[PDB]
Design a protein around this ligand. Structure first.
Ligand SMILES: Cc1ccc(C(=O)CN2C(=O)CSc3ccc(C(O)=C4C(=O)CCCC4=O)cc32)cc1
Ligand SMILES: Cc1ccc(C(=O)CN2C(=O)CSc3ccc(C(O)=C4C(=O)CCCC4=O)cc32)cc1
Ligand SMILES: [Co+2]
Ligand SMILES: [Co+2]
Lengths: 376, 376
């Protein structure tokens, strides 16, 4: 069931903003590891004395990396005279976020039809305001409300990246591309799932789509997908959600799932780079898992395609409507907190429906099953 | 003249430690950009609940990247019970350093014969203590005194990387190598050269070897080389030293000069990677500079070798004893502060004497000369 209860018009995920200590080094690492191109900047070279912000893109996926400069560079500014291109930015908030949580996502940004209206309706329906609507160059409106922990849901609306950002020079914009095309879902970890769902669904009208309980909130067309997890305590192996909350100093964004148009190419390219500056992947499932794939998805993937899944460590799950291929990186930074998922979905062709094939929850059983089997 | 006045026995540069917000991302970026291999780690996986530290090596060059975890992970520890592998580390100092200066060098480490003696003699001769001598696993002694700004001079001595560090697994240790072999010199920027030189030369006994004044302090065999620069004010173009001090919030390390055994190979490899996660280089000199090279170094470099210098943007300088090839990166991070120099020295064969060919001070005139000439 989909009651289509969105309280304002939501379009698609727009960007993800990481708050960093040094944006240059994180952005360069991510560009090489994920095959994303440098496409826009706002920094000292563009007149921004407040923050350094670098935008990477792959298809429709936009990752923004921001870090504060010394406050002394902008000490004479006030908000009416600011050189910041993102008016919600604050030095103290950024340093506090980073000190508390380490490298991670500060903003999940969605494009809406009217960011001032979305903000107004959200706050009228219980959202905690974070940054009020601000109109940039009479062209773009941006507003922020609290999502969970110190993560904000950012609303962006366009009259027709952001004013004050400059498209980057060609030489610095090497056209890397490993096949990633858009953000599929963004997942939060919280101590208590119930209150988190009630809060977010309360202000958005989004509907509902071992070691954890999870539920997914979705927009009307189910293209904005926000799963939320809570830990389950007292378990034999300690909950990975609880480890996250301990190392992150509380709730925050757990993972970003990035859709690829060719997951085999994406994983070939990312794995070639794991040990030369890129991203590592979690341990692969045992060969029993791939033996057991013929019975589960043998009508969807050929033996060769199943073998390619095994060469790359790709997991497969299936629901009533479609099939999903997925794989998980090791944590992106020092702390065992945020990671990335690469995904590709098969089925639900109408365009493809959002969330086709689910989120892989069946792989909890199949991995557990496969590991024991593998002891053999 | 070299009075050989070292107040304690100094061997060679040992390592450089960067204080970071996220050590993983900086270390991975530097590994790919400079061709350095991951060789040791101290982090959660090795029992360190305090800091994450990753060591990269190329030949004898050792770069260490350290960032703090949440203090909550180690809140029950005291110094006698610490899980930190570097006992001088402090969460508050690290966060304060990074907030003030951004990404940069915290420690210039030199190997000495006895770090406790070096510390004692240094402090007896005016050094400001930073961390007292601590014996690690009855095998290594480490001590720190203030160098300039928030940079420390770290003394390391070995009875026979550090205890508590683990050599990294093979798969994560891809054997990158672009030819870099050791640290040649490490350069500080200060507001006032005179007092800085008097302080450092006072406690070490090291001897003395537009927009700035500079002087170089050197150990007995002139293999530890510490240039220091101050700004010259009132100049037409604003001093790059003053820009550094403004953006860094005061004195700190300006550049690390890395010796290559084959500068042409190093620059070919680094430039191939500039736009795919590596390091950018400062603007190249005009072709007039390379035309003028035949008269200056035509007895040292062939026409082909001069042409290779022009293809790569390499600068050349010469003193009375040898010739130096050098080139400079753009700043390593967000702020226009720290950068890297790649160098190779020709001459002064006895082994090669330290500092053979100087530090390139003649290139200030030759670039100024060449730029005007180039207007032609
Ligand atoms: C560092 C690190 C820490 C933890 C992990 C994982 O938990 C990866 N993972 C497994 O290991 C067991 S199969 C699995 C199946 C689905 C998902 C998943 O994506 C979601 C969602 O999207 C929303 C619904 C619930 C869910 O969990 C994750 C899985 C990976 C790396
Ligand atoms: C971001 C950035 C900011 C500034 C720069 C430079 O100043 C680079 N540079 C020039 O541009 C003009 S030639 C030149 C010659 C020598 C040196 C040099 O290495 C030293 C020393 O080692 C110790 C002695 C004095 C010195 O300056 C540096 C030079 C490069 C990048
Ligand atoms: Co997922
Ligand atoms: Co130099």
């Amino acid at each position: 069931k989909n009651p289509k209860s969105d309280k304002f018009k939501v379009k698609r995920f727009h960007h993800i903003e990481f708050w960093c200590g040094d944006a240059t080094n994180v952005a360069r690492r991510f560009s090489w590891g994920l095959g994303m191109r440098f496409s826009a900047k706002s920094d000292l070279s563009t007149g921004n004395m407040v923050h350094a912000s670098y935008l990477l893109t792959s298809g429709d996926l936009r990752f923004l990396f921001t870090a504060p400069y010394s406050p002394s560079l902008s000490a004479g500014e006030i908000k009416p005279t600011t050189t910041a291109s993102i008016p919600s930015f604050d030095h103290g908030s950024c340093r506090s976020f980073f000190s508390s949580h380490g490298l991670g996502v500060r903003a999940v940004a969605i494009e809406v039809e009217d960011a001032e209206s979305a903000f107004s309706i959200s706050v009228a329906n219980g959202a905690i305001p974070s940054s009020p609507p601000i109109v940039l160059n009479e062209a773009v409106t941006i507003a922020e409300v609290k999502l969970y922990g110190d993560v904000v849901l950012r609303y962006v609306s366009y009259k027709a990246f952001l004013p004050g950002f400059e498209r980057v020079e060609d030489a610095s914009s090497f056209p890397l591309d490993y096949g990633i095309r858009r953000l599929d879902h963004a997942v939060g970890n919280v101590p208590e799932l119930g209150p988190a769902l009630t809060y977010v669904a309360g202000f958005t009208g989004f509907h509902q789509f071992s070691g954890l309980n999870s539920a997914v909130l979705a927009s009307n067309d189910e293209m904005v997908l926000l799963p939320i997890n809570e830990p389950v305590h007292g378990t034999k192996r300690k909950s990975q959600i609880q480890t996250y909350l301990e190392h992150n100093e509380g709730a925050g964004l757990q993972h970003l799932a990035l859709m690829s148009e060719d997951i085999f190419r994406t994983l070939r390219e990312m794995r070639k780079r794991s040990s030369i500056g890129g991203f590592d992947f979690m341990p692969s499932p045992p060969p029993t898992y791939y033996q057991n794939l013929k019975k589960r998805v043998g009508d969807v993937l050929s033996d060769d395609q199943i073998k390619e899944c095994e060469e790359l460590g790709i997991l497969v799950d299936r629901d009533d409507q479609g099939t999903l291929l997925q794989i998980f990186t090791k944590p992106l930074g020092d702390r065992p907190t945020i990671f990335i998922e690469i995904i590709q979905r098969v089925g639900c062709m109408m365009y493809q429906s959002g969330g086709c094939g689910g989120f892989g929850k069946g792989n909890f059983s199949e991995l557990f099953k496969s590991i024991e089997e593998y002891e053999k």
